[PDB]
Amino acid sequence: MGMLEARELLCERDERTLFSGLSFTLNAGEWVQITGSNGAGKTTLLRLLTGLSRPDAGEVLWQGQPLHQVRDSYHQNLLWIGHQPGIKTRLTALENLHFYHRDGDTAQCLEALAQAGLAGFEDIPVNQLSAGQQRRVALARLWLTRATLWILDQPFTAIDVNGVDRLTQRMAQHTEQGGIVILTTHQPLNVAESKIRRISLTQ
Amino acid sequence: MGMLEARELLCERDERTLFSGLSFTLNAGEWVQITGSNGAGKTTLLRLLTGLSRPDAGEVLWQGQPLHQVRDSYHQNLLWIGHQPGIKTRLTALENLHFYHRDGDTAQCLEALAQAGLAGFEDIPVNQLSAGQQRRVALARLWLTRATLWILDQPFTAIDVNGVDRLTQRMAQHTEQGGIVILTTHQPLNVAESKIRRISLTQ
Amino acid sequence: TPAFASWNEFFAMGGYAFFVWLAVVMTVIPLVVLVVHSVMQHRAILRGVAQQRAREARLRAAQQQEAA
Amino acid sequence: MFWRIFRLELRVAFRHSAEIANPLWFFLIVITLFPLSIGPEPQLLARIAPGIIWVAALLSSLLALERLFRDDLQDGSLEQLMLLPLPLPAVVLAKVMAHWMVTGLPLLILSPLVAMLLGMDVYGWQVMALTLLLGTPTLGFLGAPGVALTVGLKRGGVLLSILVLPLTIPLLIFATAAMDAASMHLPVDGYLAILGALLAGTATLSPFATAAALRISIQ
Amino acid sequence: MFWRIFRLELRVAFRHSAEIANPLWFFLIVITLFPLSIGPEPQLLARIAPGIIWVAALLSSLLALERLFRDDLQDGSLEQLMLLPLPLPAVVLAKVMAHWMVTGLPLLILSPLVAMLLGMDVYGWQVMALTLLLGTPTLGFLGAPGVALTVGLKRGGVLLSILVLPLTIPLLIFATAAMDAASMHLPVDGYLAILGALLAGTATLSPFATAAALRISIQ
Amino acid sequence: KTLHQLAIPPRLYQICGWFIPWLAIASVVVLTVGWIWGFGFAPADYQQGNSYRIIYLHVPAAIWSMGIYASMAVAAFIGLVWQMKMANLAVAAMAPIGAVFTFIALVTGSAWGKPMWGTWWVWDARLTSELVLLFLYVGVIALWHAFDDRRLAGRAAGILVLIGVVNLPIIHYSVEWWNTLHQGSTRMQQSIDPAMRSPLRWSIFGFLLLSATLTLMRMRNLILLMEKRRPWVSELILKRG
């Protein structure tokens, strides 16, 4: 049995059925990429898989227990990035990363920021940085987390090609071990087609 | 003489330096892309060329006259689309376009919105729309304006696959008849190197 | 010539002395604490620049280690 | 385009109504608040309510003042409103005028109702309403540079009130003295002329420097 | 991580070394602001001190109450607070308890000086502190749900503002009557007891309601 | 000439370090002789008595509070005219000195009003004006310590100081309307004897010198804080070692 599965999900926003009855089971160590065609509907589905949005019909299931019951263990194994970074603008990058778990000592600190591409910009305020860097500080969480499941909503937006390559290289190691990630980008991604499994929305 | 001229823009700021000594000139009908090393500095450069932020040293020229005096003629021949969407979230999309000049009658209405791929979603509120098509609103602004100078900061951000080809042709048809466009992007363009100029942020 | 002949009545001015000396002590305290604060902040920022020099001294040491 | 900016600001202020209801009910709760707590002795109310109404309007408008430039930065509207083919002080004047007619104007409409709860006469209502008319544009003009200085900062709290209220004290002094004297059936035309000169001074000075402060803050 | 949420809210509130003074000075702005209009006579001020300090405290709390639930929506940090491995009522309890650091205890520090400025007596200062220590947290806990509902999907016209301000009626009417009855020497324990009972009730019932309110707000 | 080369920050540091110690010695000796000749070797006024000597510790600092605000305007106007970015740091240098002088003026004025008023604080004239000046100093301090960046903070502080010095005569004339109407007060400010007034002028001179010393050395502290990584501070700390 897979870790995360989706059963007869239905979404409706203002007389438009965005998606209806989509169901998919995700096995451990997989690189599912939702394709989509419209701007919104991929974002709502990625949001609803994480449990922000209660499904109108159907349910999303995690080791056989639904998301309204097993929350305290579901939130302990998830990493989410959205269109907005989710960070605090006034604080420094170091404190914004230190809010979340671990960081702290150098075994989990100052290389997570460095491998993202942010050497020499650790102490500068986030407001005084690029929007690409304002999302890079959010993408730097991947190197220190202990979450098995990652759902990222447009990760490669205004990050340079070196950052994209280093990101996907980090994603490969999480793919080899037991870990499920769902990402959605408009840009094509430069890895072999056989490893990525396409779960496209249908109507 | 060139339409847009630069002279020794020094923008060393905030206990560091960004660039030094650029004096690039643009005559009528060119295409230019600012080179990409980091997330920003290019954005600061574009804000210096449009006149929002004052230079530390050096100056820019529009038709041989400094920009602190020719504000009216410069403001009558420019539009700005940056990282910010530039639209009001509360209002609907049609009147968001209608605030800018003309629109109104159908000779400038519903095809400025239709040709950017946002057909069928005119009277919907912006808050129930994706951020990509929120940016496509500001991209749809391009079809109904007659400004000779375009300064675009990240147009190809959260934009669908068809939107790139839809946008590039329109910027070309702006480009022949003396339309100067100053572009910043991270996505590659399906455009030959010869017709596009490259002005680089030297170190 | 002095208006106050006795040294003791310089401390007791007709029963109004305590409020005058309260004015004196609340005159002395803020100016002295301002001067000590500013001198201490000057010395602290000089020491911070010294420790900053220590840290890129270690950075150039690490660069020499990388070069060698 | 001046009236076009005026129309857009009125439309975007009227499209929502959650944040315009807070200052009006703040005014109402202060006016309902003080007489019940103080007591029903009539010798006190006729002299204390001149301060009460004006400071209630003052604190209501300082609660209202945060909407004027804060939301436009995250929407990118300021970066285009500085780019229009019109000088920035005219646009600032249009936006502050719309801000007055969205929250300062209904105080005059509510004035016949607020006169009922705390006594007064018809002459007191007329003087108080006309002084509100001459006073609230003055308050908006004096409060514009504080908001303009506090655009780029995240802070939407006590700092704006700290910057505004010491600048706003003379209006409160003159208005309270004027309508307190008007309660004594004495002519108050000179204080009204002083308030008018204050409005003329604010209209001359404030939007000319609010544009400069807004240019400083965004950069 | 409960205390870590506490410390992060304190760190986003206070930024530099000497920055705590502004919530302290804004209260003095209001406390001087009322006699600028009302008058200098030292008996009427002793009469009207409860309305003074309670309107000032309500203004400070309502001014600083926005950052609880409004700012974190746009930056998106509220969502990853919602998905932090800790129950949401504990999270909103931490956030409102961090909000109490901004308004309540600076008020408790500055209570002797504004008591001295408003006359009163030592018993007035004692009951003043004993009712402020019980009135500020219930004010924050009662102001939280209306702010929680107003963050929801942006279509609501006028009705949501009734949930936030007009709930302060029993709290403030009970507090001001107690503080006025403390002016003439009388037993006042029976009102402090019901204020403490209201504090305990709202502290028990507020975070669990605001968790469902935040669940409803973002869908 | 030398005014053009005055704006280079290492040269400004060097001339400031030249000026500080002699200025401080002159300030402390003039303030010492002023306080000695004020508190001793002088009689008291007939009516209030020995409390009258507080007119020393109240008078110059208070007026120099006003004075330093004027000086801040003299900075701030320049900081808007030619965009001399060095002039904006003087506003932050002079602001908390003015705040401390206004606080000490308010404390002395409140403490000296006891023998007639009874209550520690009575809402009389000149004290509302000092409180408003203290509030303006609080606003300038908050606006300086509010920005994350320093140059924007300095220019916004200059704008705020310009607005304050524009609006200040209106406040100073409108508060006086509380002194004609709404009862009256006694001549507490400068009810002086004409024969013995030189210690007060020497006290005026003494604070002036002390205010200059504190504002110069704080301007030095800010010019160290501003130019953090530029190599002239590096040469300074190398000369230290």
Residue numbers in the entry:
A (entry chain a), B (entry chain A): 1 to 203
C (entry chain D): 2 to 69
D (entry chain B), E (entry chain b): 2 to 220
F (entry chain C): 3 to 243
From the paper:
Here we report cryo-electron microscopic structures of the heme translocation complex CcmABCD from E. coli, alone and bound to the heme chaperone CcmE. CcmABCD forms a heterooctameric complex centered around the ABC transporter CcmAB that does not by itself transport heme. Our data suggest that the complex flops a heme group from the inner to the outer leaflet at its CcmBC interfaces, driven by ATP hydrolysis at CcmA. A conserved heme-handling motif (WxWD) at the periplasmic side of CcmC rotates the heme by 90° for covalent attachment to the heme chaperone CcmE that we find interacting exclusively with the CcmB subunit.
As anticipated, the single point mutation in the nucleotide-binding site of CcmA locked the transporter in a closed conformation, shortening the distance between the centers of mass for the two CcmA subunits from 36 Å to 29.4 Å. From the inward-open state of the nucleotide-free Ccm(AB)2 heterotetramer, the E154QA variant switched to a fully closed configuration with no internal cavity of sufficient size to accommodate a cargo molecule of the size of a heme cofactor. No heme was bound in this sample, and we obtained one data set that contained CcmA without and one with bound ATP, with only minor changes to the overall conformation of the complex. The overall conformational changes in the different states of CcmA were subtle, and the nucleotide-free wild-type structure showed the same conformation of the P-loop as the nucleotide-free E154QA variant, although the latter switched the transporter into its closed state. Unexpectedly, the overall stoichiometry of the CcmABCD changed for the E154QA variant, in that the closure of the core ABC transporter Ccm(AB)2 consistently led to the loss of one copy of CcmCD, resulting in a Ccm(E154QAB)2CD complex. This fundamental change in quaternary structure led to a structural asymmetry of the two CcmB protomers. The inner protomer of CcmB largely retained its open-state conformation, as was the case for the adjacent, remaining copies of CcmC and CcmD. The outer protomer, however, now unrestrained by interactions with CcmCD, underwent a conformational change that most strongly affected the cytoplasmic termini of its transmembrane helices hI and hV. In the outer protomer of the E154QA variant complex, the cytoplasmic ends of both helices moved outward from the core of the CcmB dimer, by 7.0 Å in the case of hI and 8.1 Å for hV. This latter shift would have caused a significant clash with transmembrane helix hIV of CcmC and is therefore the likely reason for the dissociation of the second copy of CcmCD from a heterooctameric Ccm(ABCD)2 complex.
